[PDB]
Amino acid sequence: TTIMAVQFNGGVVLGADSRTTTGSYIANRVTDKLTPIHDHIFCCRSGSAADTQAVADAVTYQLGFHSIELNEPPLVHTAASLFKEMCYRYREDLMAGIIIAGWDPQEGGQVYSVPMGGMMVRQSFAIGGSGSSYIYGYVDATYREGMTKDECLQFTANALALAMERDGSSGGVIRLAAIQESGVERQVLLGDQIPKFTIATL
Amino acid sequence: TTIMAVQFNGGVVLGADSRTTTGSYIANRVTDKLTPIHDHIFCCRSGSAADTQAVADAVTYQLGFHSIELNEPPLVHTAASLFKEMCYRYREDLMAGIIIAGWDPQEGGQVYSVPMGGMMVRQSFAIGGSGSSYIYGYVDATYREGMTKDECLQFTANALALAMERDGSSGGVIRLAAIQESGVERQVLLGDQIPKFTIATL
Amino acid sequence: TTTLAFKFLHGVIVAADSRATAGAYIASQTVKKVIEINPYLLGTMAGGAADCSFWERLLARQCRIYELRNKERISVAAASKLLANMVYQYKGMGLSMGTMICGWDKRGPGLYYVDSEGNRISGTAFSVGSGSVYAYGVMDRGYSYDLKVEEAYDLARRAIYQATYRDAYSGGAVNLYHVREDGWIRVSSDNVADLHDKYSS
Amino acid sequence: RFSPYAFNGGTVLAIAGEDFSIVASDTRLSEGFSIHTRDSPKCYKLTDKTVIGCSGFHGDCLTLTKIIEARLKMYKHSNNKAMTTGAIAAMLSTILYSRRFFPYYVYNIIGGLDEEGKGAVYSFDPVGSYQRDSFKAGGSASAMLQPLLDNQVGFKNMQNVEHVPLTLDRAMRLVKDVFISAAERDVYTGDALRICIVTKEGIREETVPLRKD
Amino acid sequence: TTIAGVVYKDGIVLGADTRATEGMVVADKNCSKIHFISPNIYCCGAGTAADTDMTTQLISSNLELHSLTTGRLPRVVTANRMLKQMLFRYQGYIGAALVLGGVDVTGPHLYSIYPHGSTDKLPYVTMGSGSLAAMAVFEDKFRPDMEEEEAKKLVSEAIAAGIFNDLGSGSNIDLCVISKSKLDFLRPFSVPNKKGTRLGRYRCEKGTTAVLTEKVTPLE
Amino acid sequence: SIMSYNGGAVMAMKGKNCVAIAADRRFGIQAQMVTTDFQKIFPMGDRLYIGLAGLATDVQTVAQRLKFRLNLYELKEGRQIKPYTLMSMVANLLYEKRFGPYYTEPVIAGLDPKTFKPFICSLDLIGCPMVTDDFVVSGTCSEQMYGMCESLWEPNMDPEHLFETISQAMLNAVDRDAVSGMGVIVHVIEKDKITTRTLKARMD
Amino acid sequence: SYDRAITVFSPDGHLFQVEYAQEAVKKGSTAVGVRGKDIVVLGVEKKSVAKLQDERTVRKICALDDNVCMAFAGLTADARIVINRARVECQSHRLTVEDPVTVEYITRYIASLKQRYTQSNGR
Amino acid sequence: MEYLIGIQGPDYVLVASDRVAASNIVQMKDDHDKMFKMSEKILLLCVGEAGDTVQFAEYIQKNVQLYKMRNGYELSPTAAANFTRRNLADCLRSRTPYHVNLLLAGYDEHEGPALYYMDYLAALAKAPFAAHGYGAFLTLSILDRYYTPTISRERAVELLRKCLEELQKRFILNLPTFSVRVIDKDGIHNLENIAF
Amino acid sequence: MEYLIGIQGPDYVLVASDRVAASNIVQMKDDHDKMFKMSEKILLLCVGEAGDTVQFAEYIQKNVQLYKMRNGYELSPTAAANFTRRNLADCLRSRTPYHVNLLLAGYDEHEGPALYYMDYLAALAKAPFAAHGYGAFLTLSILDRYYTPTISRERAVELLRKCLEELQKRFILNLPTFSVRVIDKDGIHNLENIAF
Amino acid sequence: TQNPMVTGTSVLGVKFDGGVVIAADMLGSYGSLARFRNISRIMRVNDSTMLGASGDYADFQYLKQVLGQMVIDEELLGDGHSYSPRAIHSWLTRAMYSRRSKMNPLWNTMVIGGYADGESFLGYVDMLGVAYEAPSLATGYGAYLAQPLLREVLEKQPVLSQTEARELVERCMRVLYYRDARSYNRFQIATVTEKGVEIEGPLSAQTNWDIAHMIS
């Protein structure tokens, strides 16, 4: 499992793999880990499949009622706080690593990272899951300050391809998502569409 | 602990960190993990400090006596085979991850990997230790086929700097070693001489 | 499993059942629990089936060499001591046996209780096995030193029978042996189901 | 850590007669929930008067048979005689007990003919305890075949039966019947049944198909 | 246990075996594993047999209560959410692995529900003991928008693969075909395995059992 | 094993228009036999019987609590209970104790009232019903009972032929089990009569 | 370890080392024993004690067990080894066989002890 | 360790129990009574845990006496045996279970003499003769041998004496004194204690 | 469980042991002798494990008798007690240790009466009176009360009888018979067995 | 070996008309990490026999140098005798069981492929010493995924050609990449024939990911 969210000027770019494993067998090789909560708010799921899906549906219910009551478009900080309150209160029962990234008309593009502990912090980029541990060196070296939308799509796709290459728990297909004022646009990079990196041979 | 060895046309380029920890406390921040065996043969140590040092001294004794009997410059494959026989026979007693790289007049630049199991394989580049896991994404993307001596020096230095940045067990000083027909030349990268990488802040 | 042996004026009576179980499932109901060591010595099977069979056969081997070297029969006390010494070397390893060595000696009728733990004791009456506790009850109430030969058969045969009735691990057929001065003789091999109809009438 | 033993299934059956001896077993070899092969007979002939059947851990079964085959020649070279069914049964007892503290996970049943000419069947446990009996079932479906053998061959629980002597025709039909019933209930038993017949003439083999699921 | 489901052009085909085992011994040769949820949604079952029955019956009871109040046909997502939220609440202690499939006003929807509460929406799913054998057939011969008879052949081969290879599965193959207008519940689709009929009769003769006491009580 | 503590075996069989149910009579703790005459088959409504095998406490507790719910059912409704209705009643009773079940495996045998149809089933400790057209068994010697029933049973059997089949299927399976025995009681259920026989069995 | 063959066969067919050991016993003091009806008595001749020596130490009559005693001739240094080895066997017999050691058994052990030394290497 | 024994006759019930209350390795009490008077014709023989014996036996005792006062008539030996089983079975899966192996003895006006065996798990069984404890393993076989359905009370005590002498001969635990009581049509009668 | 007791006087040693060889819950023997004859004036009383008792006691017995034959004179009670201590201490840290609690009693020609206490760990201690087993916990206090350094053997047997009667009253394990032997100037003497 | 470190996954094997084909992916998994993606797990023993191994790779290299030397030692004599496919399989059964009994086993699972005297041989060897002969073989997760696919084709058509056997393996290798997490899309195809043992280079199976869009 490898999840990624990078923030740019107009909004955010999200990316995730599609492999979910139960031991050494792949139960689903084409899992959608990018769950929509609202119109412009998305989250990334990693860890226990039963836990991540149950919390995501709960926040959608909580923010959905919150948005109508206030009669305003929901904030990304508000959606991330609802994930924070559930992951911290039931930290001994839940095994989840949620990265919440979206857009609101007040602040703009935001990336929040909520790991297993239950803490919440805003970041420029956020990586999570088992396969993320293999791309900490790449992301830190390649990340440039002030990247455009199209550059962030390439930045996320390359980092996920390198993570899926080495990690056994990660693999399958790359799912991308771009959120701005215009709306949400998603694309899937298939088997031949994946950025190929050369294999070391003598 | 992060160790690296990259092969080029003339010979090999080596690299290792300087941090050795006994839990969460640094016992030595000046550790030299590049151990000389012969005139052109070096090895990179990772894992148990007591185990790796004892094997490295034992191979030096074995290869030293072997080179005189044949009256011929020792091969890198020969030196790596002596590490292989000790790491495989006592695999349940020793914690070692040795990367052997050197030069011989018959084959040239060679990089061999002896992991925890006790197997042996020749590679164009090799990474080992605890901090090597974080730079698997970077090395796979940056590596070009047919890199010159100067390019390999920068390639090893950059990869080690990113590993020490993220890993707690890795840190301190980058120690580089370049071996060719001319001999062995070593350099030490200090504090400010370290490859600079930006920290993403809002 | 129920094995019993007692000595009296006329000789030594050896009685045993034939049920062998592998947990709750019964593997066999026809096992020869009275181990024929020599034409003059008898043993019993309790606990481990192979442990009783192998070591007493090693004893049977050792007793024959003793007869060839010394030109005389081995004493019951010496036969009990040899088996006790061999199994003692493997104490606390996994061996499990509870045998009774019977035979007519120069001193008279002999009875010894040998364990895998290392016990070796001589007495007038013994009972080994899972149903040994039930065998002691009916045996002691009808025991006498001046008991008749036919009266001795009825006591031991019923003592196994009463034990098979209560113990789940005991059953099959009751095997009876009489030990005399010239040698032991095979008395009867009565089935428990056949004896049930006999004691009812 | 590491477990040296593995349950491979398989059930071996043997019936002794007046002049015949039958040793039969299924050909299914499995591990856990998957089947290794559908053609693996547990019956193996040693001499012209002895056939052995091994069930349990196949690693021990394959090795032990090679020990017996080596010991069969050692007796043949030294004594100038073919080893009898009673001698092999006594020999296997010592070989199994030599590994007392590290036992073979094996259930052996030897079926053959004695010196007189009658059918003889010997039953073995993992450690080496043995006895002679008319019929014995050992393996995974041993608890399914035995109660039927007690009733039909031993004539138990039946009030007024004439006690008919065992013929090869009746015994062969009884072997085929119980394995059909065993394949329905026991998952380790199925695929194909192989029957070995030991007579005055020699050893003969027959194969009957079973449930493939 | 081998249960599978597939999505074709018109609807959904669900498959199941009939072997129910107690430990490593077959207890039931003919066992229904395709369960009724609603007149349009059916659900295959795996794992704990008692947990599968009671969870199915409760959701089927709730959806019948739901459909009568709404006055219209229930949705697959409603069946999914009810099974998803309940199994999560018990933290996987109810060992019920369910392959859900039905036809709505939206279209055909297939789900795989795990005992812990995780759900996956896929064109083809396999669960149970012989799921590994059944998935291999799908990963080799499955194609999008296939015919009804072609999809029925695809699932039957998948269940059969779990039957012969896996020891936990056996006997008959059950199929359930649900479309937009037609619902075919083929109970015995294929019988690949049968008992070799007994040629030797072991019928006990009248009066072979010994009786000690006899008592006859008349009835109305 | 919890089930092997008290032992016991229960068997049910189908005939033409008759149902037979048989069980052993041994009551014992682990190895020691205590009582020769122990009831395991309980009447439920003139033509319907239930046989319970497992822990001796749970055998008696379930039978008493099922009779508690049976009588209330027969008073609320002016009809005698159906075999399918009782099957679901036992299944409901056992599942109420899901995370702390009664260690007993119920077997129901009897004829359907008004419709004279035979019925047999067996349930799990947590209450999982399964219906068969041949036989159902429960107890410590389950594997022993399966081997006998798979060879002796025939499709259409008269009351007298069914009695001889179920008796021999029990006796031989019980004699290979250490924790089961001490007599076998058989209830042959017909539309006109109930025949109860105690068979001559081994007492060891 | 010394593995030289001491006792070997000769052209005529004699074991010289055995024969020379029979010459050593002839040179030793005389010892005679007779068997009676109720008592068995042995005695030694040619004590040749200088009278200035304690005659308690040079006693050739040694009891092996409670019912077994022996008198020897020849090399007194060699006999003391055999007596002590036989005395252990009398107690070793009791540990294996609860019965006391008979005269025939203990004699067979001494003879076999002498026989093994006429065939072993270095002895 | 504690010991119980009960023998049923044609019109009487004979029961006996040891008078030893032991701790670790010492005998604290010499004349301990383990029989509880339930009714005029019912006795309870309670054996088991240190605290569970007194607490459970008295709880049922007072509840049976409560039935007597509320109705006027006493409970039957059958009804009392099923009542004491119900309380033990319901407490079995609770937080506080009672580990007690008891034996109930009673005479009924219509049905006659009755003896009931009960496990600590609460399993009621009707038996002509029953015994509890480690001493039961040595005495039940003697009870299987000489027992007859038509045994006289003078022969029943003689049969009881044969079993108690086995405890003095084979049983490793010292049990000198035994309480003997007979229940018949007149009620509970105290008999001379068999001592060794 | 087994029991030992030793009372040493001015010119004699009084020692007694039980005659019960017990297994699980049954008494296998009634006349079991736990006293071993080492010399003409030395006795050894071994109590402990099932196999270690007979094997260790006889090994020292045959070695003491070996000393008698090789020299002509017997070992002194002090030398015999130190010899048996050496064999147990050396085997304590070996592969097969003997778990035996012994009590050595002997009379010397020069020193006189002697009694030695010894644990399974091999710790030798000279004592005027000592006891082994669970019964020791009930008897040592009586031996602390009525014991005098100049006690006569007429009173010592009476003192021994006082301790054995406590085992009949308080001790939970049945020990009916005891073997009594006295070692003095003339050697080992068999005294009448105290039975209950 | 008590704890396996660098391990290799499923190894396939099926015999056709006049030869046997074995395929194994070039991957050495370190727990979950794909450490080495260019290692050969298939070796040529002699002209008529070949070996493919699953499990610990360091133990495979040990068996590689032993079997390598055993063939050399035999070829030194030149007496017209060579090790048959059954002889290598029988030795390997004795080799794995002997170390199993010593409580220090080789963490390996082998598939033996051979062709001699016009007979095609396919053998299986466990780390414990379990050995048998089968027309189709699969190790690790292959026994659960690939073997069911191999059994159904050989049930319909018992004898296959070299082309039919290869396309069956490529179909099985594709499914292994779909469902086995510790597999790689770079495998070697080894084939025994009358000409000898031939191992092909890096090969990749074409994968389809059309199920990515059809969820909603």
Side-chain angles (χ1 to χ4, degrees), chain B residues 130-165:
Chain B
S130 57
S132 62
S133 297
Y134 305 101
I135 54 160
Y136 266 101
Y138 177 79
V139 176
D140 287 343
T142 319
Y143 178 78
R144 193 179 65 92
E145 193 177 307
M147 287 170 77
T148 186
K149 184 188 172 178
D150 294 304
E151 281 178 322
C152 291
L153 259 62
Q154 194 68 41
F155 179 68
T156 45
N158 290 330
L160 285 160
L162 292 156
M164 301 181 305
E165 179 68 33

Side-chain angles (χ1 to χ4, degrees), chain C residues 104-121:
Chain C
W104 202 291
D105 200 14
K106 295 280 280 180
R107 299 177 188 92
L111 174 61
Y112 280 85
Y113 171 77
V114 192
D115 266 344
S116 61
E117 308 292 318
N119 284 313
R120 186 186 163 270
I121 48 161

Side-chain angles (χ1 to χ4, degrees), chain D residues 1-6 8 29 31 34-38 57-60 62-63 66 99 102 104 212, chain J residues 2 90 93-94 97 100-101 103 105 107 124 126-134 137 143-144 147 151 155:
Chain D
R1 200 199 290 176
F2 164 73
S3 182
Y5 302 102
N8 286 303
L29 186 73
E31 192 177 16
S34 297
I35 305 160
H36 278 290
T37 180
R38 290 193 157 90
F57 177 56
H58 199 257
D60 282 335
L62 217 156
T63 314
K66 284 191 174 181
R99 283 272 215 90
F102 190 66
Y104 298 100
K212 301 279 277 291
Chain J
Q2 304 296 320
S90 188
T93 310
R94 256 59 272 169
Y97 180 87
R100 170 262 176 187
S101 300
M103 285 297 196
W107 213 274
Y124 180 96
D126 265 324
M127 64 170 174
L128 307 170
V130 181
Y132 63 91
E133 290 178 53
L137 281 173
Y144 301 97
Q147 186 80 333
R151 281 200 175 107
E155 191 84 311

Side-chain angles (χ1 to χ4, degrees), chain F residues 68-179:
Chain F
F68 178 89
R69 292 181 181 185
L70 176 91
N71 296 327
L72 289 166
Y73 181 83
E74 290 181 326
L75 288 164
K76 283 180 183 181
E77 312 194 357
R79 60 173 184 178
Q80 202 165 229
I81 200 161
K82 284 179 171 70
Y84 268 101
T85 309
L86 190 81
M87 184 188 74
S88 308
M89 187 182 280
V90 184
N92 189 57
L93 179 68
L94 292 161
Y95 201 81
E96 280 177 23
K97 305 280 181 179
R98 171 69 185 90
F99 303 98
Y102 297 99
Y103 291 92
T104 180
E105 295 174 313
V107 176
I108 305 161
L111 292 155
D112 202 313
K114 294 184 282 180
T115 50
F116 60 84
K117 283 178 90 277
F119 183 87
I120 46 160
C121 71
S122 61
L123 295 90
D124 293 8
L125 44 86
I126 42 174
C128 189
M130 64 175 189
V131 284
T132 54
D133 294 313
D134 39 32
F135 51 84
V136 273
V137 291
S138 291
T140 49
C141 55
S142 306
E143 292 181 27
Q144 284 97 108
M145 286 188 286
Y146 273 125
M148 288 302 290
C149 289
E150 279 286 329
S151 303
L152 296 177
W153 188 83
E154 288 182 346
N156 293 304
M157 306 201 85
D158 52 292
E160 290 179 47
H161 272 257
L162 184 64
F163 169 72
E164 300 293 321
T165 312
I166 197 164
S167 295
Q168 285 287 329
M170 274 291 292
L171 259 56
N172 295 292
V174 158
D175 285 359
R176 279 284 171 181
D177 194 24
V179 286

Side-chain angles (χ1 to χ4, degrees), chain G residues 8-44 46-96:
Chain G
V8 286
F9 278 96
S10 306
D12 44 39
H14 290 276
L15 300 165
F16 280 133
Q17 292 297 304
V18 178
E19 289 185 330
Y20 302 152
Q22 288 178 129
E23 294 294 319
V25 68
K26 284 174 183 178
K27 283 187 171 178
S29 300
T30 324
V32 64
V34 302
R35 191 182 70 181
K37 284 184 179 181
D38 291 323
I39 58 160
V40 195
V41 46
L42 33 64
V44 287
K46 265 104 84 61
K47 288 276 283 297
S48 188
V49 187
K51 202 75 182 178
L52 210 65
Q53 189 183 16
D54 201 331
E55 294 174 332
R56 206 259 289 114
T57 53
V58 209
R59 285 207 284 257
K60 287 182 174 68
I61 300 96
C62 297
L64 303 172
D65 208 351
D66 295 314
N67 64 316
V68 185
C69 64
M70 59 160 282
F72 66 87
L75 293 160
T76 174
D78 291 37
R80 193 173 46 91
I81 301 291
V82 182
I83 296 160
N84 287 345
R85 287 283 286 270
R87 278 169 175 171
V88 174
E89 190 60 39
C90 292
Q91 302 299 129
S92 296
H93 184 264
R94 281 197 177 96
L95 281 161
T96 319

Side-chain angles (χ1 to χ4, degrees), chain H residues 6-72:
Chain H
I7 303 162
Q8 191 203 154
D11 64 319
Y12 67 91
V13 187
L14 179 77
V15 281
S17 57
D18 64 304
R19 296 206 294 179
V20 181
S23 186
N24 51 93
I25 55 156
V26 291
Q27 290 179 233
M28 297 188 295
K29 196 166 163 64
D30 197 39
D31 55 306
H32 186 257
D33 203 355
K34 288 160 188 172
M35 303 194 182
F36 293 89
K37 194 183 179 183
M38 305 294 287
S39 298
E40 292 292 316
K41 290 172 186 175
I42 311 165
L43 279 172
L44 194 76
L45 286 283
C46 205
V47 151
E49 271 286 314
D52 296 347
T53 40
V54 187
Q55 284 288 122
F56 186 81
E58 284 192 31
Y59 178 78
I60 312 295
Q61 189 187 234
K62 270 78 185 184
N63 283 320
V64 165
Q65 286 289 317
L66 184 66
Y67 186 95
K68 183 183 181 285
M69 297 310 299
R70 284 169 69 179
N71 303 135

